[PDB]
RNA sequence: GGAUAGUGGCCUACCAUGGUUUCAACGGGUAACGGGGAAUAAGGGUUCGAUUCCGGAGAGGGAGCCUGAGAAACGGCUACCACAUCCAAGGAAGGCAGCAGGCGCGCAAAUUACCCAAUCCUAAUUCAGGGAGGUAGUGACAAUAAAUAACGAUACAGGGUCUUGUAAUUGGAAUGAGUACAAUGUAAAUACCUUAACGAGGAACAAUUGGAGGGCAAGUCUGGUGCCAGCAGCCGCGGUAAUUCCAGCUCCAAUAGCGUAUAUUAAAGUUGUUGCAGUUAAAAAGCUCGUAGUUGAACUUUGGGCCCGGUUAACGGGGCCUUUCCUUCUGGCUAAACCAGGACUUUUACUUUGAAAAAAUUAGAGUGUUCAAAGCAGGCGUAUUGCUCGAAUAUAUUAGCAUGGAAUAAUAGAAUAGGACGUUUGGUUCUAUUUUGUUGGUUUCUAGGACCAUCGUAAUGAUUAAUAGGGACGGUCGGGGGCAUCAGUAUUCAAUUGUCAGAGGUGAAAUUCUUGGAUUUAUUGAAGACUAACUACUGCGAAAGCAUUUGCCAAGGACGUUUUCAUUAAUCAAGAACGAAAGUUAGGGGAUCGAAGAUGAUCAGAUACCGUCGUAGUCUUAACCAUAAACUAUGCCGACUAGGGAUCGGGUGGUGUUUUUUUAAUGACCCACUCGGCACCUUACGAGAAAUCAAAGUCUUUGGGUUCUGGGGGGAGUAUGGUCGCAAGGCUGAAACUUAAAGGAAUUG
RNA sequence: GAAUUUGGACAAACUUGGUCAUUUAGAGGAACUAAAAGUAGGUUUCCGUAGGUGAACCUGCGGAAGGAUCAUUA
């Protein structure tokens, strides 16, 4: 029984059969339809640079709130403009605007992590130089 | 319709054996099913069986004695490479010291231990344990 | 259970556990021979001589008490019909479907009933010119099916 | 025929009309050079392979060509295209996907260094050349080995006279990170190995990277900061969607490494062949027929005896006999029959063994690179003219070749004998390796074939009839279908008649009909629809569905059968038949009910959102549409597993009951048995998340055959494409994006 | 034996016409968002289809329970 043909001539109907059924997937339809190189904010990539649009100011609640918020960047290769997320307070005046920032995912797939909806990026390098290290005054910002 | 008579006369058997019955009847029967049963006497599964004899196709009545745990056929039969039969024990066996894969070879139906002994192999047919 | 029902019978006849002539029989083997072929040419088919010798001679089975079956005596002789005895029914059985059919036009029962024994037609005259008893194309037709049958 | 180095539609003339494909041809995509291989390791798989080895192709894009054995060559030429260089403005020259190096692109990648010393290649050739190649520079791609300390003495805490730790207590030893004579190394140097001299007392020569609610190891720490119509009153306590707001102390893990991002793999049985699921959680086509595909009952030499002989009485080997080695031919024993010998599947599938299968990589044997990753080295001596081991082995899962086997699954053979076998006789048709001197032709003999006829020789040739299937027949059975016919009240309308003031409608009114008599009563007539009660945990049909009488027409299941054929079967993309209600195009007829529409009153409450009139429709014919909670929310075929009582159809039996008007057939009933149904009750041998299930059982101890469908929730049955339909619409049917849940089953507040 | 020339095969490329496909301007609109802050009642739950309504919703025809069986006799 079991609803699968079971003849020792039978491996065609198996073959199409599992080639429709793994069409029906998540990671086998993005990966062979190549989802990653036209509609995805990277071209299929780890990092990627981009210039600082704007500081947008989206806090945490009214006025008694943790600030975490952070900016609107235009990419460099595709143009696009998504949001990021800068690291903890006394980061956020380190990126100015047109500040040539280098960015990585956030750890989930292309999902927020954490409680801030619609970011899905994080500031690693800002003006070429670092983030964590010129937070921590081990370094200091180049001018320009 | 009746793809396989000795699936009928496995199942047959064990529904026999797990309801705990003496002795089943079982038809058709047949070369396969005659050699199968053969194999199960000699290595103490079964009981004793007869041949009843009429005209068109026959039927066995097998006299059960315990120490059956599971016997089993393997629909289609694969053909089973030599160095590939401990594959297929590894597949369907409990353990390795008790509990036979019977293969259907050119010199005959046989258990899988005779036919690593005699260096010979074919499809594969059935398991009993 | 069936080809073209639910249906799930099992009643049928039941051949005896006995190949050896039975004793009260005690007759001939030749005369029922002749006999068989008279009957054939008064015009029955071989089933209706089957029942007639069982109902009336004694002949339990034509295959035991000859040792050939009966539609290898009429063929033995020169009696075979051109078509086999069950695809002439199943046609005949069709022909007179379709002759309802046309009369009664909006009978859709009859008109599933007539696709199932064409079907069924189909099958036995493909098995039929595959065992290479009947022509080998023998092209059944609706029209012509007619003319076939008388 | 031409052309080619040569075959070939490679080209040309002539003639045919073929060739491929549902076993997926042809077309479209590829973020596609192919392979040896790489990661992942229970197995099977999944993912990558531009890249050091092999083969292909290109030198900015196309095309053409000389030289030459070899090029459609670009560190060769020619023309066009796109770029672009130089200047005296006439003209000339170009091709880094060779090695360095630059711009651009980017998340992403090094020196315009030295040399032929090694490996090999080229040349007239030991000698010349080689950005091939090697050496060094940059280099945390990856991989190997392991520095940042070790031992005492004194005082305490101990276990307690021998053992641990603590200390702004103390003693000297050891050594390389480095600096560097020298020598080695090297084409020349750098570096490594060796080494005279210098080089350790803590802010030395100082180790980092993450984390401490759970997952997941380690805080019942400290302080400060921003908010309070909470207490107190200027000290403060407590609360703070302060998603902790931040620092310090302490602790955990790994360590010259650690973290993060994307992708991929294992745990995942979220691809499921092994190995998923489909009653209710995603998911069984509305139903049936049916082509390809997949799958398909049993059966034909088994058994016995004989020896010999391999391994520690058991396992496994081969030959003889038992009606039993059949087959294509030479050399000998002989009187078609033996021996020595050349070999054979009607066709396969399968399986054992073997050959031929690049190295590197993988598994693995040997060997102290000081160990190890590596490497194929090395080992031993009178170390004075020496000796010698090795560089194994395994894997390669398809295809092709050779070979032993004959279980399993297929194919064919004698049915109109046109079948086999021969020292059975005749005729035809052909051939000669020869002898008559060699040869051409003529004839006979001889020998070998093939063919047409007659004698025989023989156990002369046909497997069961599957609790598979179709067919025939007998008696039934059914609210199964079509046409025609018959009937029953009821509803509405009309005629006649009786009598008077209201009748309908609502929780309450109003619209409506009414002294030309409303509603009600009586008699009669007409039209269309529908078939109550009987009507059931009953029946029929593939489902949708089917309920008055009678007739005709064809069909159907089950039972009975010592009838017939002998596999004709199960499931099923393509294709097709039917398909509730609603709906569409014309004709008919319109009694009820009634979408739409029209009017009445809208009274807090409609809990009691209504009333009356009424179009399409409801009925039917001829065409369309193909959808339903089309539900048993359970695909179809087969096998087995548990008790009981009803009930429908058929059959068997009863010196059983009843009505015959004589107890003969037959009917109704009762008891027992059987086959095929619709169902019901209890239980768990079992199953499950549970509700529950005799199937939803026979399953981690996972395989009887087959078809369809599903892969977290939304976007979405949406967009686009195609196709069917007059239309309504149907069938097929995404993605971007967004989210950590949506959900199923019971018990409890 | 050069310049030059006739015919042919190999053919780069340029002008026009059609066609395939990618990206970017362009009125209009409908969707979604945070928008801290705008304008008492009916209650069976659905399915297919037709008509009507800002708005779920209502009505007509057919279907399902994924809706809670008491008493009596046999």
Not at chain 1, 2 to 18: D, E, F, I, T
Not at chain 1, 31 to 53: D, E, Q
Not at chain 2, 92 to 103: E, S
């Amino acid at each position: 029984g079991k609803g699968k043909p079971r003849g020792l001539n039978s491996a065609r109907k198996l073959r199409v059969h599992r080639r429709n059924n793994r069409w029906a997937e998540n990671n086998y339809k993005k990966r062979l339809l190549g989802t990653a190189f036209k509609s995805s904010p990277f071209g299929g990539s780890s990092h990627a640079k981009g210039i600082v649009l704007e500081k947008l100011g989206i806090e945490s609640k009214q006025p008694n709130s943790a600030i975490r918020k952070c900016v609107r960047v235009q990419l460099i290769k595709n143009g696009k403009k998504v949001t990021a997320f800068v690291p903890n307070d006394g980061c956020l005046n380190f990126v100015d605007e047109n500040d040539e920032v280098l960015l990585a995912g956030f750890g989930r797939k292309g999902k927020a992590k954490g409680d801030i909806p619609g970011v899905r990026f994080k500031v690693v390098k800002v003006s070429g130089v670092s983030l964590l290290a010129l937070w921590k005054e081990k370094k200091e910002k180049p001018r320009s | 319709t009746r793809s396989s008579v000795l699936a009928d006369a496995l199942n047959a058997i064990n529904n026999a054996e797990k309801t705990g019955k003496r002795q089943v009847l079982i038809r058709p029967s047949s070369k396969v099913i005659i050699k199968f049963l053969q194999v199960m006497q000699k290595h103490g599964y079964i009981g004793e069986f007869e041949y009843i004899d009429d005209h068109r196709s026959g039927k066995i009545v097998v006299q059960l004695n315990g120490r059956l745990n599971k016997c089993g056929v393997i629909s289609p039969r694969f053909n089973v490479k030599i160095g590939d039969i401990e594959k297929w024990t590894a597949n369907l066996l409990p353990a390795r010291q008790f509990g036979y894969v019977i293969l259907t070879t050119s010199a005959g139906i046989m258990d899988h231990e005779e036919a690593r002994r005699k260096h010979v192999s074919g499809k594969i047919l059935g398991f009993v344990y | 259970g069936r080809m073209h029902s639910a249906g799930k019978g099992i009643s049928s006849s039941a051949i005896p556990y006995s190949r050896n002539a039975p004793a009260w029989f005690k007759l001939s083997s030749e005369s029922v021979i002749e006999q068989i072929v008279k009957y054939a040419r008064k015009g029955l088919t071989p089933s209706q001589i089957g029942v007639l010798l069982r109902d009336a001679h004694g002949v339990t089975q034509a295959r035991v008490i000859t040792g050939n079956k009966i539609m290898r005596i009429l063929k033995s002789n020169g009696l075979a019909p051109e078509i086999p005895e069950d695809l002439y029914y199943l046609i005949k059985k069709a022909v007179s479907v379709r002759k309802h059919l046309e009369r009664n036009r909006k009978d859709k029962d009859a008109k599933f009933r007539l696709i199932l024994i064409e079907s069924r037609i189909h099958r036995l005259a493909r098995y039929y010119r595959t065992v290479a008893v009947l022509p080998p194309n023998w092209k059944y037709e609706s029209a012509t099916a007619s003319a076939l049958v008388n």
